[PDB]
DNA sequence: CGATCCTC
RNA sequence: AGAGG
């Protein structure tokens, strides 16, 4: 279930609960049409690519697929009323906050992602300790891990030291 | 000074490790860290 | 307290470092590689004192 | 450093009054952090101190020889005889307040070494100076008023950040920026510079 | 490689680094002499005219002063030598190479520069004494420690150059890092250890100390909080006064194990507004954790507010600890009399398990397990019994450690130490290995000449029965020395190899960047990715969250 | 092996399953053997995956491999980083290594390639073919003392 | 008498053990601090070396010359050279000491604290005389001389406090203990089995009643009744270390009070 | 206003779970056959043992900065020995007609079960707990 | 008299050594829990005996107190640092005209010493001072 | 080399005033006094006595950096009581206590023989 | 190298106790610990000052000039 | 030729951090060079602090040229670019 | 045909 | 060449 994704919906909801002084004792001014169509409309405005054509519109659709899976599950009609107990004013604010934070979460062009990726891999590699294997306690767990493995990978080694085939 | 006068150098099958046979002959501790570790020994 | 064991060359004190070498006239056997046509080698590093 | 692989530079210097004190008025000459102990597993450091404390009190040379029968218990038994708590702990009072510290401190003598290479022997700074002949770039070493190397590894972090202009500044204005004349035909440094 | 990709530069300074609990996260302690060497070319405008002319008359030897003066037609006036150094009446458009002063952007570096976080922009703070001073929470991204390390400082010379440092490279900006989509900074050492201690249910403070702690927070509202206790004494809890450091609108929830919204063990976490409801504040909250207090504060309140938080927590915690105190003696490695009896008999029964397997093997009754040698089976079992022994004995010791045990206290906080450390120092060091297996027969059929030929007993093959507290026997010592050496060679080997790998990684990826069409492309304009990381999102603005539709029973999904 | 599988009541459960670990690789032949799950068969030899199952499968195995080195240590690096490295080795059609005869042999800038390894000869064969350097690479602008199209330089500023 | 009370248990030429009752912990500490740091004294703060053919370096000798205890009884009737209107020093702000030693004997010749001799006009002030505590009739051993060896130098003794340099301290360790029975629960004793058995009981435990086992904790209780022992170097007498200690603290509190009037 | 809850409880269990000054009190009211109580008490100032009759009250008044207790002519709403200030954090309903309220007195937790609570305890950073005898 | 003998690593192969004289060869037939656990005899056909096990160490490591209570690389680290430490390198220092000289003003002999030190002349030309140290969290500096 | 002169601990510099009374912007009837070339000897002593006065609402001090001999003292008093008056009363009370102690020691000292 | 004046830790004048310390061991035949106590060096900081001092000066005085 | 039409612009309407930093830098450079200020300075003396207020009040006369990989480019004025950040 | 960073 | 992180 737990996957790194943009926008912390939990934090937005709890921020609304405090900001709008929500009481779990008063009935909500929300309607089913407000929640169902509200979350539906929010999904339309979560932008990554702003191309006016079929290819880029489907690319944009694909990019937001997972975050919308999260958005739907978190902002379901039952949950909004039963769990969260949000009002129309509070629910509307939650919707505006998600959209704003999502566009804020998008990568900026010019970002040298190449160097970023290389360093992000390179640094933890220097910090590695038991380069042989931590699975040395058992005689049937003999696989070249750590630094020598990373070396085999990166160089595209024609012959590995521990070539294995896991069969299901 | 005493330590320098009692130093050993091994140029260049694993020679960096403290081999069993070094007992009583070469110091188990005294060796430089990094670069030439276990190649520079002390009696 | 000076222990000696060094030389005075052009004023500078010089300590001669013990050089570790493999002993001569020693007969050592080795298993050789995986593709190699030859499987085992007997070697002698002959030398005169 | 202690005789136990415990490297450490000075953080601050405190005069006697700001320092914490024992009920006897004994103040430490040095203060080390308890954090530089568990991972390091330098148990001997603590034992040396326990022994050295009993040794200073009894007026004897402490035997710290390796393969012996000297035990932490035996040393502790001797220190308690000297009227101190067996494990080197001592009630200490705060220098600023005078109030007892809630915690008791491991206090005692420990042989420390004054190592070479001190701050002042290293403190270097350059904001323009002598240039190497061949490359027209800053020289090497402090004892020459040299420039610090902004290596390729450093260059990479600037690219990561996307600081294009600073990366250019370091590579030109801070080092070897130069004006050459080129022709629009051969495109080589052939052009004879005849200014004024 | 040495003159084009990298080179030696002007406006650079290097010095030994030292910790400062009174410096701000983004600040750097620059020694007076260094500040008096490095300059910034500042053009004379009516905004700075008076300040520049004062610094111009302050000279190159008095700190808030200047070195050279650049005139129209470009010619430097050396203020250390000029006969007109006293005179010099400034003009607009002229440049004044003024000394480096407070709150100037400067690039701070610690080599090897394996990160973007290895090079960060810091605000200047000119101080006495020869060391470069930094905040302990900025220790981790640089991977520094104050045991003799040195750091470089680079000075921007252009207005746009300093803007690149302040708006892109600044320390608060780098807090939440895209490498692991979590913060790359957190509360360490004294501050980590001390926070756990202060934050306990048992911890209560008197009015006299409360006011002092409240004042230490620079941001403080001036409103004295109502004490948790107003009975035969007005008493404040540690949790209350630390909540003063936490800003309003910060909501954090955790749940560890025994956590029940009624936290009997005082575990997990619950923070509602600028007040902590329950749970002890340790590494999981205040460290550089994923769902931690820092990731929350940076994302909610901002980078500048979060950087301020490091200072606030540090100023309070260190003060309380300064007056509470914290030590560690030889007494903390000492385990109970009956505990040692248990430990010694634990290793004794392990030695018996080994003897019996040995006896079984020697009788040819040891069964042939598929995929491995009859002897490979033996060694596998022996090593297992010996590792099980060390762990059982270690647990026996660590269980006996009281909550007042300074070593136990440090592990509990997450400042320093781990189980393995307690186990080796108090109970049993354990088995030693070289090339993955236990101590080999270097001599003919023996490890040492003190043993007999063909001896496979734990003691003869590197098993250290004794703890560091007890002391290692000569054989045990030499064996631990053998295993130790391997660790040092593996260190020496790694640093050089891992460094080359990183260089190759950087070189192969250099030119890959996100273009204006949200596509990842190289120097040839070739498409690597159609959307960065398959979504076109920046890694720093991402965090782990449960997709609620995937889990649970069908009945629970319906409900 | 431990396996997380959905129970008929909906919730995920632990279902232990028999798995075979092999000291050797011949994917081509082993997957054709009966009684196995050919959809699930795996090997650490990403070359063998690429040769038998294609480049896209090779990319999956390549990441799986890079990820495993990082994970084993305890460390965590964001997906996109390894994804980029993995895609870079993959995009050339096959498996382009991170060696001098891997990425450095590629059709990039003559100056940007001589910055890594084989410096002089890289320039020599560039002088023989008479290469035209784009000067769009980071390394060229670094060498030429110009503001590169990196972050700040990725756009021009007009009045 | 009135407010804070003193009860001297032990008194001698070198030490003063007393009970400081009816005081605040803040005052007990401020007095302890000021005794170590802010009471002024006379010490060598300039060494002009004429000849030095000894085995030791000039600054090594100079450093230990500053460490030599000198009479500071009448230190208040001597100025800090910084306030003095002279050029460098005079007889109102300094004491000039002369030291001349030669290896006259074949046997090693020792240089003692007694060998320093006042040149300056003392103007009838018990000041400058090197403090001689040693029974044998000589002070601090400064240097050792062989035969050909010679040492000739002039010393300027100036007024100052420990905050500037530790040599200006009438110092020596000050013993300080309050509440020996841990009734105030000011500390939490580390233990293995029994805190009572593992921790040794104080000398001050006789002077205070022990807590009555199953008695409720005294929350309201505050720190009063302090057990102190002030040791003197010899520069200034014991009583004066404490009196001038009270006096220095008194003066600097009054200093602030006066600054509020200038405002 | 005034009070919001008042009852006399009887101590069943007293647990000092690794704390030297704090104890977790398990109490049930002598009058109400459904009323429960779970609370962290500082035994160092006010000790509580097995089978004690405690008068527990939740007030709301006797915003702003705390002034030292200068009881010259001051009057706080107490003829009580133990006084605490806290925050309401969870109003979790247990069953059909059984509500539970959670209060944290600067980390010292409190849980009260029953149903007579009603529209009185309603979520507030304001909460005074008073105990006598 | 042949009471003692010279043995190299090749001849070491043919011999059986005892670590302690008494503890390694007396007889058989209660124990201090503080003392470390030692094997027993088991080996019986002893041809030689170790003069002292502490002799396996060399010059720098012979300065370390209780190395038998330390982690193996910490002993390695100190062996390099002892060579960095200041002290009186020689008595004739002021008579020699050498590049770089560092002499401790008041060097002190260590309170806790090894038996090896006597031959290493450590207490005669010391490299440090017996500082009253407190292991404590003070100002956090 | 970068080490500051020791007189800078107890001696005021050019333009350096002993006290600097600054009104607090966060609280009513509150002031922040900056004591120059002073430490814990005077800080903790004044703060503890200022606290003894039942007309004072707040009293706290801090030495923001050990390198410098400054200290900040924050005072908040009841309406109709100036913080400068509260500080003046504390100072006098301290001197009064010290005066008593001085003669008290002197009296008991003149009872001893050694 | 010559007995230090005053104890680094506390400042108790130790520079006048050495000649007397040496006499207590050589002539009086006392043990170091009991000899230290007789000179009034009660605290362990003062004790290490003398008991730990190496008087190198005597060796330096053996060189002629 | 080459350019892009005013209508239908795919590039992000929001200003990038790099765009912001360069704009802020370039404007601070001209302020330090005695160029006119387009906002009422309220005790502001630092060229970067002034430029920040000019971007806050949207009184900067600069255009960003967003170069697309195909050689083409998009022209965006600081006045139109959204400064969320 | 390569093998972390930095000063003497 | 030797060392420091
Ligand atoms: Mg380090
Ligand atoms: Zn041409
Ligand atoms: Zn004068
Ligand atoms: Zn002393």
PDB file of C-alpha atoms in Angstrom, chain A residues 29-167:
ATOM      1  CA  UNK A  29     -23.660  20.742   4.589  1.00  0.00           C
ATOM      2  CA  UNK A  30     -22.173  18.586   1.755  1.00  0.00           C
ATOM      3  CA  UNK A  31     -24.208  16.724  -0.885  1.00  0.00           C
ATOM      4  CA  UNK A  32     -23.377  13.473  -2.764  1.00  0.00           C
ATOM      5  CA  UNK A  33     -23.134  15.520  -6.029  1.00  0.00           C
ATOM      6  CA  UNK A  34     -20.629  17.911  -4.271  1.00  0.00           C
ATOM      7  CA  UNK A  35     -18.239  15.053  -3.273  1.00  0.00           C
ATOM      8  CA  UNK A  36     -18.568  12.664  -6.294  1.00  0.00           C
ATOM      9  CA  UNK A  37     -18.307  15.398  -8.982  1.00  0.00           C
ATOM     10  CA  UNK A  38     -15.883  17.496  -6.896  1.00  0.00           C
ATOM     11  CA  UNK A  39     -13.224  14.770  -6.765  1.00  0.00           C
ATOM     12  CA  UNK A  40     -14.033  14.016 -10.481  1.00  0.00           C
ATOM     13  CA  UNK A  41     -13.434  17.673 -11.432  1.00  0.00           C
ATOM     14  CA  UNK A  42     -10.239  17.873  -9.292  1.00  0.00           C
ATOM     15  CA  UNK A  43      -8.728  14.970 -11.336  1.00  0.00           C
ATOM     16  CA  UNK A  44      -9.186  17.029 -14.578  1.00  0.00           C
ATOM     17  CA  UNK A  45      -7.007  19.891 -13.257  1.00  0.00           C
ATOM     18  CA  UNK A  46      -3.976  17.913 -11.940  1.00  0.00           C
ATOM     19  CA  UNK A  47      -1.539  19.133 -14.667  1.00  0.00           C
ATOM     20  CA  UNK A  48       1.945  17.783 -15.611  1.00  0.00           C
ATOM     21  CA  UNK A  49       1.833  18.262 -19.453  1.00  0.00           C
ATOM     22  CA  UNK A  50      -0.283  21.048 -21.086  1.00  0.00           C
ATOM     23  CA  UNK A  51      -0.509  19.731 -24.695  1.00  0.00           C
ATOM     24  CA  UNK A  52      -3.813  20.325 -26.590  1.00  0.00           C
ATOM     25  CA  UNK A  53      -3.553  16.916 -28.442  1.00  0.00           C
ATOM     26  CA  UNK A  54      -4.381  13.155 -28.125  1.00  0.00           C
ATOM     27  CA  UNK A  55      -0.738  11.902 -27.627  1.00  0.00           C
ATOM     28  CA  UNK A  56       0.174  14.380 -24.867  1.00  0.00           C
ATOM     29  CA  UNK A  57      -3.378  14.137 -23.314  1.00  0.00           C
ATOM     30  CA  UNK A  58      -2.953  10.347 -22.982  1.00  0.00           C
ATOM     31  CA  UNK A  59       0.644  10.848 -21.743  1.00  0.00           C
ATOM     32  CA  UNK A  60      -0.775  13.268 -19.086  1.00  0.00           C
ATOM     33  CA  UNK A  61      -3.557  10.708 -18.315  1.00  0.00           C
ATOM     34  CA  UNK A  62      -0.869   7.957 -17.807  1.00  0.00           C
ATOM     35  CA  UNK A  63       1.390  10.180 -15.623  1.00  0.00           C
ATOM     36  CA  UNK A  64      -1.439  10.997 -13.153  1.00  0.00           C
ATOM     37  CA  UNK A  65      -3.062   7.459 -13.120  1.00  0.00           C
ATOM     38  CA  UNK A  66      -1.553   6.319  -9.754  1.00  0.00           C
ATOM     39  CA  UNK A  67      -1.957   9.619  -7.831  1.00  0.00           C
ATOM     40  CA  UNK A  68      -5.648   9.655  -8.918  1.00  0.00           C
ATOM     41  CA  UNK A  69      -6.011   6.032  -7.635  1.00  0.00           C
ATOM     42  CA  UNK A  70      -4.878   7.450  -4.275  1.00  0.00           C
ATOM     43  CA  UNK A  71      -7.071  10.598  -4.621  1.00  0.00           C
ATOM     44  CA  UNK A  72     -10.274   8.528  -5.279  1.00  0.00           C
ATOM     45  CA  UNK A  73      -9.592   6.022  -2.409  1.00  0.00           C
ATOM     46  CA  UNK A  74      -8.834   8.838   0.048  1.00  0.00           C
ATOM     47  CA  UNK A  75     -11.697  11.190  -0.968  1.00  0.00           C
ATOM     48  CA  UNK A  76     -14.594   8.672  -1.279  1.00  0.00           C
ATOM     49  CA  UNK A  77     -18.177   9.860  -0.434  1.00  0.00           C
ATOM     50  CA  UNK A  78     -18.426   7.545   2.613  1.00  0.00           C
ATOM     51  CA  UNK A  79     -14.908   8.492   3.981  1.00  0.00           C
ATOM     52  CA  UNK A  80     -15.407  12.279   3.529  1.00  0.00           C
ATOM     53  CA  UNK A  81     -18.658  12.160   5.585  1.00  0.00           C
ATOM     54  CA  UNK A  82     -18.139   9.139   7.923  1.00  0.00           C
ATOM     55  CA  UNK A  83     -14.361   9.447   8.738  1.00  0.00           C
ATOM     56  CA  UNK A  84     -13.208  13.072   8.058  1.00  0.00           C
ATOM     57  CA  UNK A  85     -16.620  14.717   8.724  1.00  0.00           C
ATOM     58  CA  UNK A  86     -15.714  17.712   6.436  1.00  0.00           C
ATOM     59  CA  UNK A  87     -18.038  20.646   5.530  1.00  0.00           C
ATOM     60  CA  UNK A  88     -18.624  22.185   2.023  1.00  0.00           C
ATOM     61  CA  UNK A  89     -16.305  25.143   2.929  1.00  0.00           C
ATOM     62  CA  UNK A  90     -13.623  22.785   4.360  1.00  0.00           C
ATOM     63  CA  UNK A  91     -13.972  20.179   1.501  1.00  0.00           C
ATOM     64  CA  UNK A  92     -13.653  22.935  -1.173  1.00  0.00           C
ATOM     65  CA  UNK A  93     -10.382  24.213   0.486  1.00  0.00           C
ATOM     66  CA  UNK A  94      -8.974  20.632   0.532  1.00  0.00           C
ATOM     67  CA  UNK A  95      -9.626  20.398  -3.237  1.00  0.00           C
ATOM     68  CA  UNK A  96      -7.850  23.754  -3.974  1.00  0.00           C
ATOM     69  CA  UNK A  97      -4.846  22.765  -1.757  1.00  0.00           C
ATOM     70  CA  UNK A  98      -4.287  19.385  -3.536  1.00  0.00           C
ATOM     71  CA  UNK A  99      -4.297  21.009  -7.054  1.00  0.00           C
ATOM     72  CA  UNK A 100      -1.905  23.818  -5.972  1.00  0.00           C
ATOM     73  CA  UNK A 101       0.516  21.404  -4.186  1.00  0.00           C
ATOM     74  CA  UNK A 102       0.498  18.953  -7.151  1.00  0.00           C
ATOM     75  CA  UNK A 103       1.582  21.645  -9.698  1.00  0.00           C
ATOM     76  CA  UNK A 104       4.133  22.744  -7.020  1.00  0.00           C
ATOM     77  CA  UNK A 105       5.402  19.084  -6.887  1.00  0.00           C
ATOM     78  CA  UNK A 106       6.194  18.951 -10.677  1.00  0.00           C
ATOM     79  CA  UNK A 107       9.901  18.861 -11.781  1.00  0.00           C
ATOM     80  CA  UNK A 108      11.336  22.160 -13.110  1.00  0.00           C
ATOM     81  CA  UNK A 109      12.843  22.108 -16.672  1.00  0.00           C
ATOM     82  CA  UNK A 110      16.587  22.733 -16.620  1.00  0.00           C
ATOM     83  CA  UNK A 111      16.943  20.289 -13.654  1.00  0.00           C
ATOM     84  CA  UNK A 112      20.212  18.397 -14.174  1.00  0.00           C
ATOM     85  CA  UNK A 113      18.649  15.003 -13.368  1.00  0.00           C
ATOM     86  CA  UNK A 114      21.618  13.152 -14.912  1.00  0.00           C
ATOM     87  CA  UNK A 115      24.166  14.316 -12.321  1.00  0.00           C
ATOM     88  CA  UNK A 116      21.421  14.045  -9.624  1.00  0.00           C
ATOM     89  CA  UNK A 117      20.814  10.338 -10.424  1.00  0.00           C
ATOM     90  CA  UNK A 118      24.547   9.465 -10.647  1.00  0.00           C
ATOM     91  CA  UNK A 119      25.367  11.136  -7.241  1.00  0.00           C
ATOM     92  CA  UNK A 120      22.202   9.622  -5.620  1.00  0.00           C
ATOM     93  CA  UNK A 121      23.574   6.103  -6.482  1.00  0.00           C
ATOM     94  CA  UNK A 122      27.302   6.948  -6.126  1.00  0.00           C
ATOM     95  CA  UNK A 123      27.147   8.368  -2.560  1.00  0.00           C
ATOM     96  CA  UNK A 124      25.301   5.392  -0.837  1.00  0.00           C
ATOM     97  CA  UNK A 125      27.789   3.075  -2.645  1.00  0.00           C
ATOM     98  CA  UNK A 126      30.772   4.715  -0.858  1.00  0.00           C
ATOM     99  CA  UNK A 127      28.943   4.143   2.481  1.00  0.00           C
ATOM    100  CA  UNK A 128      28.666   0.336   1.922  1.00  0.00           C
ATOM    101  CA  UNK A 129      30.128  -1.915   4.696  1.00  0.00           C
ATOM    102  CA  UNK A 130      30.063  -5.746   4.202  1.00  0.00           C
ATOM    103  CA  UNK A 131      30.796  -5.919   0.408  1.00  0.00           C
ATOM    104  CA  UNK A 132      31.115  -9.775   0.454  1.00  0.00           C
ATOM    105  CA  UNK A 133      27.630 -10.805   1.889  1.00  0.00           C
ATOM    106  CA  UNK A 134      25.789 -10.461   5.259  1.00  0.00           C
ATOM    107  CA  UNK A 135      24.237 -13.923   4.390  1.00  0.00           C
ATOM    108  CA  UNK A 136      27.632 -15.622   5.273  1.00  0.00           C
ATOM    109  CA  UNK A 137      26.068 -17.388   8.317  1.00  0.00           C
ATOM    110  CA  UNK A 138      24.365 -20.015   6.076  1.00  0.00           C
ATOM    111  CA  UNK A 139      26.356 -22.044   3.437  1.00  0.00           C
ATOM    112  CA  UNK A 140      23.424 -22.039   0.878  1.00  0.00           C
ATOM    113  CA  UNK A 141      23.251 -18.152   0.661  1.00  0.00           C
ATOM    114  CA  UNK A 142      26.525 -17.557  -1.326  1.00  0.00           C
ATOM    115  CA  UNK A 143      25.758 -14.607  -3.709  1.00  0.00           C
ATOM    116  CA  UNK A 144      28.174 -11.770  -4.671  1.00  0.00           C
ATOM    117  CA  UNK A 145      26.528  -8.611  -3.214  1.00  0.00           C
ATOM    118  CA  UNK A 146      27.676  -5.063  -2.271  1.00  0.00           C
ATOM    119  CA  UNK A 147      30.470  -3.234  -4.176  1.00  0.00           C
ATOM    120  CA  UNK A 148      31.784  -6.204  -6.309  1.00  0.00           C
ATOM    121  CA  UNK A 149      28.190  -6.862  -7.504  1.00  0.00           C
ATOM    122  CA  UNK A 150      27.626  -3.192  -8.366  1.00  0.00           C
ATOM    123  CA  UNK A 151      30.985  -3.338 -10.241  1.00  0.00           C
ATOM    124  CA  UNK A 152      29.829  -6.457 -12.245  1.00  0.00           C
ATOM    125  CA  UNK A 153      26.519  -4.690 -13.105  1.00  0.00           C
ATOM    126  CA  UNK A 154      27.912  -1.267 -14.199  1.00  0.00           C
ATOM    127  CA  UNK A 155      30.696  -2.817 -16.313  1.00  0.00           C
ATOM    128  CA  UNK A 156      28.189  -5.320 -17.909  1.00  0.00           C
ATOM    129  CA  UNK A 157      30.298  -8.358 -16.882  1.00  0.00           C
ATOM    130  CA  UNK A 158      30.337 -11.198 -19.446  1.00  0.00           C
ATOM    131  CA  UNK A 159      30.924 -13.617 -16.534  1.00  0.00           C
ATOM    132  CA  UNK A 160      29.448 -13.132 -13.045  1.00  0.00           C
ATOM    133  CA  UNK A 161      31.096 -14.737 -10.011  1.00  0.00           C
ATOM    134  CA  UNK A 162      27.759 -16.078  -8.641  1.00  0.00           C
ATOM    135  CA  UNK A 163      25.407 -16.718 -11.649  1.00  0.00           C
ATOM    136  CA  UNK A 164      22.052 -17.949 -10.253  1.00  0.00           C
ATOM    137  CA  UNK A 165      18.654 -19.002 -11.645  1.00  0.00           C
ATOM    138  CA  UNK A 166      15.663 -18.837  -9.228  1.00  0.00           C
ATOM    139  CA  UNK A 167      12.947 -21.295 -10.454  1.00  0.00           C
TER     140      UNK A 167
END
